[PDB]
């Protein structure tokens, strides 16, 4: 953990559920075919639930939770979403209640499967946004607050500027970790809250090196919008300034939650090569995404690729992936 | 690393499949709960695909494939089966082919969706037994070595004698990184290969820790057997002794695959407590075995739980688990 990185987060209260650093992996094959030296960063490995991601937020979106005394967390996404279940067990794990309010088939697979099983409460709306649901969750907060009850209700994705804090975090943790000096770290963005915290947190230990996102999904207009948004607010509460331009390129193949053969492929191949599995919505097209860009010299000669998680994509979406290899 | 264990094992070759030392966590909620410390060691996380304990026997068992020249690795299992798909992924992996051979319910779920997703080449037969495939698999070895190519073949569960020291080496690891004094160490028996190597490691460091297994299946005749045999044959590769009597107790509740809601109430209670994800098969049933034993004041102060895995199982018979809960 740097120094600076350490006393900058240090008037932050977190709950500790990740004890311990995740590691970081040379990719040999991977490496040996795009002509550039490709690692990764295991945050699949955070520990809680399916890990991923997520987890390093919730770290401080739940520390916040408890802060103001919060006894019921409520969040959103779609059906298949990482962040609702994971948030909705850490909260459970912490004696909070939850309430996740999802959009979509309601199939039992994937997370919602895991939500059922762990018991997490569930409710499924019509909406078609992320955002959409936001007001219904405010709506399921804005009442609940009348049983007595104090809800504590956490942005898509934890797109939250403490949740952004949980990436500083990852980069001073790479910082001390690694042994390698990189050209640029590739990660894929959904609320492009994790490629904030990147960013903010190589910002901070002014870094030449390059913050790649990868948008899986709707690119940007009010997206690449909040990111500085959300760049600008968690540096303020950090009290520091924000080194200009996080990259951002677009391998969304057309929308959020579209599966295409060659992100099938991509999962295959790294998983036969380097004994990796990769999932549909998200690491499987950030991956695409760097193998593209590398190949085309683009992203440098040390690419550092952050593993976010998302197993579970890749047991709900498994017949559409097999149905295209 | 034990300099013991250490010097015993430096002779072998291993394929270096786990770049890192798994972590061990306390569990506070279960042990408040039950009246015993217990921890945690993650065996779930050791990386390469779904993870879990079968990745230490796989550096052994693939090591010694690829001594023989081996370029096709076959094995078995049920349908369901965490060994089979791992050691498929890792074969792959090291430019090997591989051949599963299963048996079960062909329905696109758990491992073996997780098979045909990777493109691993699946053959299902109408056996019964996880043995009665044994031959099958010999039928397509003795055979394929026809086609000029050479087959190695790896018995259920990696249950082979250098499988075995797959766990001899996990005893080193733990024994170096843990700063706790245990009393018994808890894990899931299938082919008992795991709580062999455990066994042999204690014995090897003259612990007096309780080895502990709790069989999920068939308990024990030609596997009660099997397991002595199993932990006098690596012994005689390691050219040591063995401390005489592992552990073994029943929580199978009646045959191997039965899922219970009490298997179900403790998968439900271990996420929602610790936000740890357990699995129908085998450490759902392993830990119910532990909480039972401990609350019986049977297992002693610290008990040491070997999560090893499985996470698939709960996704492939999640519904079975819901309609229980
Ligand atoms: C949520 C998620 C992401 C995206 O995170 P953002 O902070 O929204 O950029 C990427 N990968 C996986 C597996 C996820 O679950
Ligand atoms: C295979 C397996 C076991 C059993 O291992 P043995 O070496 O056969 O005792 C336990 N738990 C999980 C999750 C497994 O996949």
Not at 100 to 116: A, I, M, P
Not at 217 to 243: C, H, P, Q, Y
């Amino acid at each position: 953990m740097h120094p600076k990185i350490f006393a900058l987060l240090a008037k932050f209260p977190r709950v500790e559920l990740i004890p311990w650093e995740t590691p970081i992996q040379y990719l040999p094959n991977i490496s040996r075919e795009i002509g550039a030296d490709v690692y990764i960063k295991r945050d699949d490995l955070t520990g809680l639930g399916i890990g991923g991601n997520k987890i390093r937020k919730l770290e401080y979106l739940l520390g916040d939770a408890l802060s103001k005394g919060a006894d019921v967390v409520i969040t959103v996404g779609a059906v298949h979403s990482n962040h609702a279940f994971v948030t909705g067990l850490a909260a459970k794990k912490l004696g909070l209640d939850a309430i996740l309010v999802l959009r979509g088939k309601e199939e039992l697979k994937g997370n919602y499967l895991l939500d059922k099983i762990m018991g997490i409460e569930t409710r499924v709306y019509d909406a078609k946004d992320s955002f959409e649901l936001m007001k219904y969750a405010e709506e399921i907060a804005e009442e609940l607050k009348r049983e007595g009850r104090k809800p504590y209700v956490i942005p898509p994705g934890g797109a939250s500027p403490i949740g952004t804090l949980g990436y500083v975090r990852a980069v001073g943790e790479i910082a001390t970790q690694s042994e390698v000096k990189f050209d640029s770290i590739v990660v894929a963005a959904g609320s492009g809250g994790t490629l904030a915290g990147l960013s903010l947190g190589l910002s901070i230990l002014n870094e030449d090196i390059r913050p790649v996102g990868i948008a899986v999904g709707r690119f940007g207009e009010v997206m690449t919008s909040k990111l500085d948004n959300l760049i600008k607010e968690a540096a303020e509460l950090l009290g520091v300034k924000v080194e200009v331009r996080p990259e951002l390129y677009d391998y969304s193949f057309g929308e959020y939650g579209k599966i295409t053969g060659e992100v099938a492929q991509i999962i295959r191949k790294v998983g036969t090569r380097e004994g990796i599995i990769l999932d549909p919505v998200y690491t499987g097209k950030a991956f695409y995404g760097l193998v593209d860009l590398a190949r085309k010299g683009e992203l440098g000669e040390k690419i550092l690729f952050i593993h976010t998680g998302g197993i579970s994509g890749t047991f709900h979406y498994g017949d559409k992936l097999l149905s295209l290899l």
